[PDB]
Amino acid sequence: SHMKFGVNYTPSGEWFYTWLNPKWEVIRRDLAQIAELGADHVRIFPLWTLLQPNRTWINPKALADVRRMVELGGEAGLDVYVDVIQGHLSSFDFVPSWLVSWHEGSMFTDQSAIEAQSALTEAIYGTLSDMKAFAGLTLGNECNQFTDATHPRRMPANAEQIGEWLDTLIGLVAKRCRRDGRLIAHSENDAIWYADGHAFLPRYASCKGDVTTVHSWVFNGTGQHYGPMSCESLGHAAWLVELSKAFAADPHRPVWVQEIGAPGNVIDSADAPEFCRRSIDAIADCPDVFGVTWWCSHRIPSAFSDFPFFEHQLGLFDVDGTLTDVGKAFRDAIATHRDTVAPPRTTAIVIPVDEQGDPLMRAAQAPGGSLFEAWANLNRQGERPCVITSLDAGNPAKLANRGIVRLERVELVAGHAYNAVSDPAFEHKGE
Amino acid sequence: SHMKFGVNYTPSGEWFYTWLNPKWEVIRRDLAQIAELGADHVRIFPLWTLLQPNRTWINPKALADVRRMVELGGEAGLDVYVDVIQGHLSSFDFVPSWLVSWHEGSMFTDQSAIEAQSALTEAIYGTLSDMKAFAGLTLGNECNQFTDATHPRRMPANAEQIGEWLDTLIGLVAKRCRRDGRLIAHSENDAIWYADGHAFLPRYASCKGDVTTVHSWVFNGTGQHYGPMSCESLGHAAWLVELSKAFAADPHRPVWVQEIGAPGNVIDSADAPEFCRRSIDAIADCPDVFGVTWWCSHRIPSAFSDFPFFEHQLGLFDVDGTLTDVGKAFRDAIATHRDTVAPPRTTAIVIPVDEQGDPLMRAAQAPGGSLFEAWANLNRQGERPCVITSLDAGNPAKLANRGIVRLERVELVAGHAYNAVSD
Ligand SMILES: CC(=O)N[C@@H]1[C@@H](O)[C@H](O)[C@@H](CO)O[C@H]1O
């Protein structure tokens, strides 16, 4: 299998505020620039506040604007993946008025809100279903952040309710997607892998939807604790790939590195091209990688305020469309790994899990944890490790299915390097 | 003085959700209907989330759409008053992403947020400054609800900080408004009059800005406690008018009944037309009333959810564009009171206040309180009462300035009917 290469599309000039009045000629130029990198896809982000301003009214103009952006992606030669519910983007929440303050509720447990998200998922798919360039959808960007204990306006849910939420929304379109040749996925930030007590469970990402998504951001403590250009940092995206497979029922389920960037709050801007190149080298040595989607296409204009300062500099293109040095590195990484095939990984570290296949201690597989470091140490040694659970460790069918010949046991100890936020201004904000 | 008559404009068909993609031919039809009533003005409500999606970027298309709505109001023969910051509408909050959750802050005390609201106020005035139909500006609809303790995501502030917030935003445009022939005002819900401990103080509404605004809603406990068609309920808007004057430094400052409706959660729908007519009768007998602005023009379509159901029925025009029975009553009230001049009110009840002019007990002037009931009882008796503070009572200059010849002193007794419901 060969990896797809794509970009998370942040519109130049107006960022996601462009949805208020999209400048289609600029958007056309944006997408042509992305296609010229050699990218085969983009991921795009409509805003929930504009799509569904009332629980029972979806704005047809917002739907038509999503269709027009998909249309222009196809005209640039790009497949277009659409995230349905934002929801959350770049430290900001976009929640419709009917779910805040006087109408505060949980998108995960309020049945009328679930029905609204169901209507929106169906409306987005149905609006785009006739489009050759529409490649698939993700329920929404890192929606799990809303239910984590760290969120300042937390939407409550237990793990069973999260599973029902995922099953409900994915089940609306899964068969259509299967018949049409499209993808359905969901997306969580790395709390699903790292945060003990978090209501989204690893197996949800690795078993629900068509492909596992991971978002790899080394400002999560990895770059700070080990160094921005350490093997732990450069291999972090590959670690998430291999970690996620331990919780997959399917031994060859594809893993989508749906976000990776070189954040300037931990990586020096002069090192970002090398971080890009070497992170993708490590990803390409993991089998069954669905693709790599870089964050992000275009720098945020300096006129916009309240972003973490590093966010402004994440773009492959500057605000006028000029290719940045990281853009050159991503372009070159695409050319390098267009046909890279990773050989099987045959030495596995074992994650102790409970009877449901959930980790006994997610902190042990977080930065600084024993499982995190056991994998990093073997990768550093050239052993190319994979990851399984203790349940699978006693199932030769699954082991043979994955080609695993060697097992390494490791005891659980929490790391303390993991930080659940990307800026110190967002810390200590739980209710 | 003669009263203006206007309507709070809720766009037909799509409500304030139309701002995403306004249907200008429908909006033109909406405004023509309002003018056909005999209304001389509308009050309109852009959304803060669309105007200012980033703290340091105001959306030019959102500004242009406000300009276009004002233009169409003028073409219908209407003056247009614009509320800058919504903020709050019909039980919903519209707060930009840069002031929520991970970026949660208080619009009243966060200096960077205050500068953003300043930039937005200046952008709205400047966008509209060349429009003949642009008549004035209100800072925002019932902005004080964000700082009330009842708010689930409260923006904290003390009373001094609220005064500074008002002074800052009003001062940006007050001189321009005066030179241009326009109005600057601010708007609070009735917590300012009724809620002990609330950081917005009565004197703020009656002294800051060019006219006092009141929003009169008898679901605040008045209709529940006395009855929807009682004199206490029918006179509630006139009560707010006369109560507000007690805290004004200017003895003839105009009072704008900027919202009044007949809410179906307390008033039977069959009684709403007579509630309209008789409430305006009582308002029309108060001097210096700037105008009466009915809530609202057009009913919310039944396809939209999560509104308190009574809210759906508040429009003067039905979802099919037909004039409702309340619309007929409002139309007739305009014709009845176009030329009404209210004679001076000369018997005053006295509100005990402290040395800063703030009430000793706001609950006593709230529904069920002795001062509330003293006014309602005198008005029912035909005594046409007004209201002063205990400070005004020992100041013959002000007394003579208002023509007050008789005082009624009242013992303080707290009311308990106020239920803090403003939506
Ligand atoms: C409040 C905050 O910083 N949230 C960020 C989020 O924007 C980002 O997408 C995610 C990536 O894992 O990391 C979180 O910490």
What one-character-per-residue DSSP string does B195-223 give? -TT-SS-HHHHHHSSSSEEEEE-TTTTHH
d(CA A70, CA B173): 44
Residue B320: partners with Cβ closer than 8 Å, 6 or more residues away: none
Closest ligand 1 atom number to CA of residue A190: 12
Residue A126: count other Cβ atoms within 10 Å of its Cβ.
Answer: 12
Cis bond leading into B296, ω under 30°?
yes
Nearest CA to CA, how far is A100 from chain B (Å)?
7
A213, β-bridge pairs? A256
Whole-number Å distance between alpha carbons of B102 and A405: 46
Residues B219/B421, Cβ–Cβ less than 8 Å = yes
Spatial CA neighbour of B50 closest among B39, B41, B40, B61? B61
Least Cα distance to B7 among B267, B276, B294 occurs for B294
SS3 of residue B268 by DSSP = coil
SS3 content of chain B, % helix, strand, coil (to 5): 40, 15, 40
- Kindly state the tokens that stand for A238: 């590959």
Burial (0-12, 13-18, 19+ Cβ within 10 Å), B407: middle
Report the distance separating Cα B285 and Cα B328, nearest Å. 21
Q: A215 CB less than 6 Å from ligand 1?
A: yes
Q: Which of B20, B49, B98 sits opposite A306 (nearest CB)?
A: B98
Chain A residue numbers touching B49 (CB-CB < 8 A): 49
Collapsing DSSP to helix, strand or coil, B413 comes out as coil
CA angle B113, B115, B116 (to 5 degrees): 65
User: How far is the centre of ligand 1, averaged over its atoms, from the C-alpha of A219 (Å)?
Assistant: 9
Hunting for tokens 């601010």 — which residue is that? B186
- Check CB contact under 8 Å for B151 and A305: no
Distance A259 CA to ligand 1 centre (A): 12
Reference A213, options A182, A236, A190; nearest CA is A190
User: Which residue is closest in CA terms to ligand 1's atom 15?
Assistant: A421
Nearest to B368 by CA among B318, B324, B412: B412
C-beta atoms of B100 and A98 within 8 A: no
What is the helix (H) or strand (E) element at residue B140, kind and residue range? Answer: strand B134-140
Q: Give the separation between CA A212 and CA A263, rounded to whole angstroms.
A: 23
Radius of gyration of chain A (CA): 20
Evaluate whether A308 touches A91 at the Cβ level (below 8 Å). Answer: yes
A421 CA distance to ligand 1 middle (Å): 6
Take residue A322 and report the two structure tokens written for it: 């000029």
For residue A249, the tally of other CB atoms under 10 A from its CB is: 11
Token pair, residue A350, equals 């074992």
Whether the CB-CB separation of A31 and A72 falls below 8 Å is answered with yes
SS3 B398: helix
Q: Is B24 helix (H, G, I), strand (E, B) or coil?
A: helix
CATH code for the structural domain at A4-337: 3.20.20.80
Closest C-alpha among A129, A209, A206, A123 to residue A171: A209
If phi > 0 it is left, if psi is from -120 to 50 it is alpha, else beta; for residue A209 that is: left
Q: In whole angstroms, what separates CA A391 from the centre of its chain?
A: 27
Whether A189 is in the pocket of ligand 1, judged by its Cβ within 6 Å, is: yes
Residue A301 · residue A263 · CB < 8 Å: no
Q: Are A64 and A19 in contact (CB under 8 A)?
A: no
Give the dihedral of Cα atoms A109, A113, A115, A121; nearest 10 deg: -110
Amino acid at the residue B177 = C
Of the candidates B218, B210, B215, the residue with the CA atom closest to the CA atom of residue B234: B218
Q: What torsion do the CA atoms of B160, B163, B164, B166 make, to the nearest 10 degrees?
A: 160
R_g over Cα of chain B: 20
3-class SS letters over chain A:
CCCEEEEECCCCCCHHHHHHCCCHHHHHHHHHHHHHCCCCEEEECCCHHHHCCECCECCHHHHHHHHHHHHHHHHCCCEEEEECCCCEECCEECCCHHHCHHHCCCCCCCHHHHHHHHHHHHHHHHHHCCCCCEEEEECCCCHHHHCCCCCCCCCCCCHHHHHHHHHHHHHHHHHHHHHHCCEEECCCCCHHHHCCCCCCCHHHHHHCCCCEEEEECCCCCHHHHHCCCCHHHHCHHHHHHHHHHCCCCCCCCCEEEEEECCCCCCCCCCCHHHHHHHHHHHHHCCCCEEEEEEECCECCCCCCCCCCHHHHHCCCECCCCCECHHHHHHHHHHHHHCCCCCCCCCEEEEECECCCCCECCHHHHCCCCHHHHHHHHHHHCCCCCEEEEHHHHCCHHHHHHHCCCEEEECCCCCCCCCCCCCCHHHCCCCC
Given a contact cutoff of 8 angstroms between Cβ atoms, the answer to whether B78 and B42 are in contact is yes
Q: How far apart are CA A279 and CA A275, in angstroms?
A: 6
The backbone torsions φ and ψ at residue B79, rounded to the nearest 5 degrees and listed phi first, read: -75, 145
- Calpha distance B3→B260 (Å, rounded): 14
Phi, psi (5° rounding) for residue A171? -65, -20
A93: contact with B, CB 8 A cutoff:
yes
Structure tokens at B25: 């031919």
Q: How far apart are CA A102 and CA A86, in angstroms?
A: 21
C-beta atoms of A57 and B304 within 8 A: yes
Chain B positions in Cβ-Cβ contact with residue A56 (cut-off 8 Å): 303-305
Probe residue for ligand 1, chosen from A89, A93, A142 as the CB with the greatest number of ligand atoms within 8 Å:
A142
Is B383 a known ligand-binding residue?
no
Query: Which residue in this structure is represented by tokens 């450069």?
Result: A234
For residue A420, the ligand 1 atom closest to its alpha carbon is 15
Measure the CA–CA gap between B54 and B116, rounded to whole angstroms: 9
What does B67-107 look like in DSSP terms, one character per residue?
HHHHHHHHHTT-EEEEEEE--EETTEE---GGGSGGG---T
Torsion angle, CA of A403/A408/A411/A412, rounded to 10 degrees?
A: -40
Q: Which among B86, B60, B56, B82 is positioned nearest to B71, based on CA atoms?
A: B82
3 state DSSP class of B28? helix
Given an 8 Å threshold on Cβ–Cβ distance, is A306 in contact with B92?
no
Sign of the C-alpha dihedral, residues B21, B23, B28, B31?
negative
Using a CB-CB distance cutoff of 8 angstroms, which residues of chain A are in contact with residue B102? 91-93, 152, 426, 429
**What is the dihedral angle through the alpha carbons of A396, A402, A406, A411, rounded to the nearest 10 degrees?**
-90
Task: State the pairing for strand pair B92-93/B88-89.
Answer: antiparallel
Give the integer Cα–Cα distance in Å for A157 and A174.
23
Bond into B87 cis (ω within 30): yes
CB-CB contact of A160 with A102 (8 Å): no
Ligand 1 atom at minimum distance from A142 CA: 9
- Closest C-alpha among B360, B380, B375, B361 to residue B408: B375
* Residue A96 and residue B47 in contact, taking contact as beta carbons nearer than 8 Å: no
Contact criterion met (CB below 8 Å) for B200 and B147: yes
- DSSP label of B358: -
Task: Give the number of beta-carbon pairs within 8 Å between A and B.
Answer: 98
Compute how many other C-beta atoms are within 10 angstroms of the C-beta atom of residue A25: 9
Q: Please classify residue A339 by burial: count the beta carbons closer than 10 Å to its beta carbon, then call 0-12 exposed, 13-18 middle and 19+ buried.
A: exposed
Query: Two tokens at A317?
Result: 């293109």
Chain A contact for B153 (CB, 8 A cutoff): yes
* Three-state SS at B312: helix
| Burial of B320 from C-beta contacts in 10 A (0-12 / 13-18 / 19+) | exposed
Residue B75's beta-bridge partner residues? none
Residues in chain B with CB shorter than 8 Å from the CB of A94 are 97
Map residue B4 onto helix, strand or coil: strand
Contact B305 A55 (CB under 8 A): yes
Domain ranges (residues) in chain A: 4-337
Residues whose CB falls within 8 Å of the CB of residue A317, separated by 6 or more in sequence, listed in order: A12, A30, A33, A297, A298, A299, A323, A324, A327
Amino acid identity, position B285 = D
Residues B328, B334, B340, CA angle at the centre, nearest 5°? Answer: 145
Mapped onto helix, strand or coil, the DSSP state of residue B364 is: helix
| Whether the Cβ atoms of residue B141 and residue B89 lie closer than 8 Å to each other | yes
- Report the length, in residues, of chain B: 423
Quick one: angle between helices B272-284 and B325-337, nearest 10?
20
A416 annotated ligand-binding residue: no
Chain A residues closer than 8 Å to B153 by CB:
100-101, 104, 153
Helix or strand run (H / E) with residue B289: strand B289-295
What is the distance in angstroms between the CA of the first residue and the CA of the last residue of chain B?
31
Method used for this model?
X-ray
The reply to whether B106 sits in an annotated binding site is no
Angle B176-B179-B181 from CA coordinates, rounded to 5°: 100
Helix (H) or strand (E) holding B41: strand B41-44
| Helix B272-284 vs helix B236-245: crossing angle, to nearest 10 | 30
Phi, psi of B135 (to 5 degrees): -100, -20
- CB contacts of A55 in chain B (<8 Å) are 305-306
B207, B363 Cβ separation under 8 angstroms? no
- In the chain, the amino acid numbered B249 is A
Q: What is the DSSP letter of B369?
A: S
CA distances from A132 to A27, A28, A182, A290, A293 (A): 19, 17, 10, 20, 20
Work out whether strand A92-93 and strand A88-89 pair parallel, antiparallel, or are unpaired: antiparallel
Q: Which of A23, A47, A54 should we substitute to test contact with B (largest number of B Cβ atoms within 10 Å)?
A: A54
Backbone angles phi, psi at A183, to 5 degrees: -115, 140
Distance CA B35, CA B77 (A): 7
Query: Which strands form B386-389's sheet, in the order they lie side by side?
Result: B386-389, B347-351, B406-408
Nearest-angstrom CA–CA distance, B228 and B219: 9
Question: At A277, which amino acid appears?
Answer: R
Beta-bridge partner residues of A351: A389
Token pair listed for B409: 């002193």
Choose among A393, A422, A338: nearest CA to A5.
A338
Helix (H, G, I), strand (E, B) or coil at B192: helix
Strand-pairing partners, residue A388, are A350
Query: Count of H helices and E strands in chain B?
Result: 16, 13
**Alpha-carbon distance A80 to B168, whole Å?**
47
Atom of ligand 1 nearest to the CA of A90: 7
Cβ burial of A276 (10 Å; 0-12, 13-18, 19+) is buried
How far, CA to CA in Å, does A162 sit from each of A148, A157, A210? Answer: 12, 6, 18
Q: Does A50 touch chain B (CB under 8 A)?
A: yes
